[PDB]
């Protein structure tokens, strides 16, 4: 009954914004999200289902992550439009409904409920922001049509629209493919990845933070419910990792390169889909969410509209803690020991090998070794000479948040036997 909290806070604030200043609405949104996160904590191991709304490990883990990213990105947003806060709340609820259900049509309603505010949140009014919003909107509506005809063919294979049905042969395969299309689109899986670089590049940096945390979390939370065959999974993984890393080599801009990196990481995460572990994947996505939110909060402190690769450099001289955290984050996103990115990568690779897919896994590993080119061109650059770059060195809010995120990344890298024992029912 956290969904009740979200609905109540969103609907109350919708009117209260007419009586309350945007700062008051901001603080109210912060309180509501923190209370929803706490409610998730107190409900660890307390499954609660009403209808198609079903709370399992995936629901709890991924909604906790989404609320974390939402709280972080609200910490940064101070705009004098209460709307620019309300949407966040809305998106949260929507993504919540995406991970907490098995009904395919309710999945579609949740997809729309989370996707609509995300189109608008990217409107700092820069023309490229609008170009990105239009590309995003059209491709997302195309993916919604594909997902919908997949749900229709699913109902063609069985009397219910709930996942877990036995499933037929070719028609069930076609329906599952048409569902996976839209779901991986939301998860930045290739060959549906084209929107990601343009959208990440055009939108303001804190919006891309919110995206790169909550969108990917909720999309994989919805993906785990699907019984994806391993051959299509191999196709998606291979194409995503290869094209992502290769085209990321040639990129000159930080945000576009990072969108390509998120494509490669979604390809990596899709390996747990071989086993559908949802424990290892919860841990992996926890680490990736923390690191990327950190990096994009820093990028927001650098530049909202666009951040070039040189801008990242010299940050340590500018800010010591920020440079350290960016370096640690780059290494964790590379999946290097003793960092939690390595545990997530190892857990996904173990699930994939346990399913017996070898060439795909080796290719992902070789390409991930290739990724050190730009992962190092970013992580180490913290120490370079500062070139011309606008730099606003943030408030103490974001500094302490970045510190906590980096410390937690390295701590879960060193000692995963602390939380990972509790990513199932949660003893």
């Amino acid at each position: 009954m956290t969904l009740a909290i979200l609905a109540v806070f969103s609907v109350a604030l919708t009117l209260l914004g007419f009586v309350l200043p945007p700062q008051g609405v901001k603080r109210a949104t912060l309180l509501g999200l923190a209370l929803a996160l706490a409610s998730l904590l107190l409900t660890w191991g307390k499954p609660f289902a009403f209808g198609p709304y079903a709370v399992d490990g995936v629901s709890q883990v991924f909604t906790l992550l989404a609320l974390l990213g939402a709280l972080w990105t609200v910490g940064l947003v101070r705009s004098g439009r209460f709307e620019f806060y309300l949407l966040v709340l809305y998106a949260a609820l929507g993504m919540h409904l995406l991970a907490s259900t098995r009904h395919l049509l309710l999945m579609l309603v949740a997809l729309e409920a989370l996707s609509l505010p995300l189109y608008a949140l990217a409107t700092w009014r820069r023309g490229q922001g609008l170009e990105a919003a239009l590309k995003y909107f059209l491709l997302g509506a195309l993916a919604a049509a594909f997902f919908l005809y997949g749900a229709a063919l699913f109902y063609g294979a069985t009397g219910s629209l709930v996942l877990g049905a036995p499933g037929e042969g070719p028609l069930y395969a076609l329906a599952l493919g048409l569902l996976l299309v839209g779901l991986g689109f939301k998860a930045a899986l290739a060959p549906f990845h084209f929107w990601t670089p343009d959208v990440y590049q055009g939108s303001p940096t804190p919006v891309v933070l919110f995206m790169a945390t909550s969108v990917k979390a909720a999309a994989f939370a919805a993906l785990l419910r699907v019984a994806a065959p391993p051959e299509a999974l191999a196709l998606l993984v291979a194409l995503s990792v290869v094209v992502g890393n290769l085209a990321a080599l040639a990129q000159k801009e930080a945000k576009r390169l990072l969108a390509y990196s998120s494509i490669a990481h979604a390809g990596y995460m899709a390996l747990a889909l071989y086993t559908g572990n949802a424990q290892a994947l919860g841990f992996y996505l926890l680490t990736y969410v923390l690191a990327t939110g950190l990096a994009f909060a820093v990028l927001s402190q650098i530049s909202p509209d666009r951040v070039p690769l040189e801008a990242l450099r010299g940050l340590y001289r500018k800010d010591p803690l920020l440079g350290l955290a960016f370096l640690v984050a780059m290494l964790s996103l590379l999946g290097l020991p003793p960092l939690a990115g390595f545990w997530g990568k190892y857990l996904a690779f173990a699930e994939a090998a346990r399913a017996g897919a070898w060439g795909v896994l080796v290719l992902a590993l070789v390409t991930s070794a290739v990724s050190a080119y730009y992962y190092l061109g970013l992580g180490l650059a913290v120490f370079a000479r500062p070139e011309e770059t606008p730099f606003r060195p943030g408030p103490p809010w974001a500094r302490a948040a970045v510190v906590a995120a980096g410390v937690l990344l390295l701590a879960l890298g060193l000692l995963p036997g602390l939380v990972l024992p509790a990513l199932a029912a949660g003893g």
Binding site: G177, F194, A247
Partner: protein
């Protein structure tokens, strides 16, 4: 002469890195920015995936 040959071997490894980057930018040039290009490549990949699923 073998020192020269080691120099050439390291240069060939560099050539491998350069082939990787060149392939990368050839795949990066695939994103032109016209939405029609993106939707066409989207539909092509989705058809390909649905064909593989058999």
């Amino acid at each position: 002469a073998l020192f020269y040959g080691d120099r050439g071997l390291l240069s060939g490894y560099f050539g491998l890195g350069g082939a990787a980057r060149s392939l990368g930018q050839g795949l990066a040039r695939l994103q032109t920015g016209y939405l029609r290009v993106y939707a066409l490549l989207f539909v092509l990949g989705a058809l390909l995936l649905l064909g593989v699923m058999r």
